[PDB]
Amino acid sequence: SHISPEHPMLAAVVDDLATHGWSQQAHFLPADLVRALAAECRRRDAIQWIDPGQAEACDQYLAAMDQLRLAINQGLFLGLEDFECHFALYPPGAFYRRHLDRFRDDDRRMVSAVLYLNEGWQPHDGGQLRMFLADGVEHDVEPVAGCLVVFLSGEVPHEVLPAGRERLSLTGWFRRRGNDP
């Protein structure tokens, strides 16, 4: 597909990355597309990297993230060559311990981006992404449908607290070429 879904202005995501190292955007994509992505997530659960030509919903997600790639390059000069992503479905009780996405070891992943897909999430459900920001500040993100979180991979440690219900997301990374051919 060649359709490009509606999304809020990317300039704000880029300014946030520059100023704070991270950005969060509610309703990043229209609700019908987010639901279609939730559906594809469940379909795949029943690593499958996502590429154009696999499903309509995914094609539209990639088109938007490609726009975000070009916007990031423009504003922050990162030389990002591509975006890789895949679905993730955490069973109730699953958690992800504190970690950094990019090690100090040349890792090509420069910027992380997670799109959440869960309708009707409540705080009793847990499952927040917890981000460890500068100055010892912590920030929880509830994995609410349509919510996009973007951050610098080498900079923001983060974890996922266990949820009481299936937790759906689309997780990815913008990458540089890197020094190894």
Token reading at 48: 């499958």
Contact with Mn ion (CB under 5 A): which of 40, 59, 101, 125? 101
Please, after which residues is the chain broken with C–N above 2.5 Å? 46
Q: Please, what is the minimum distance in Å from the beta carbon of residue 135 to ligand OGA?
A: 21
Whether the CB-CB separation of 72 and 17 falls below 8 Å is answered with yes
Token reading at 75: 């504003």
Q: Residue 101 annotated as binding?
A: yes
DSSP state of 163: B
DSSP state of 105: S
Nearer to ligand OGA, 59 or 101 (CB): 101
Q: Please, what is the minimum distance in Å from the beta carbon of residue 43 to ligand OGA?
A: 18
- Any alpha helices (H) in 46-173, and if so which ranges? 56-76
Whether the CB-CB separation of 163 and 144 falls below 8 Å is answered with no
- Picked from Mn ion, ligand OGA, none, the partner binding residue 129 (CB below 5 to 8 A depending on kind) is ligand OGA
Q: Please, what is the minimum distance in Å from the beta carbon of residue 3 to ligand OGA?
A: 26
Separation CA 157–CA 103 (nearest Å): 11
Given the rule CB under 6 A, which residues bind ligand OGA?
88, 96, 101, 114, 129, 158, 160, 169, 171
Question: Binding mask 45-74 vs Mn ion (x if CB under 5 A, - otherwise)?
Answer: ------------------------------
Nearer to ligand OGA, 2 or 97 (CB): 97
Nearest to 81 by CA among 65, 63, 69: 69
Which residues are annotated binding-site positions? 99, 101, 158
Which residues are annotated binding-site positions for Mn(2+)? 99, 101, 158
Binding site for Mn ion (CB under 5 A): 101
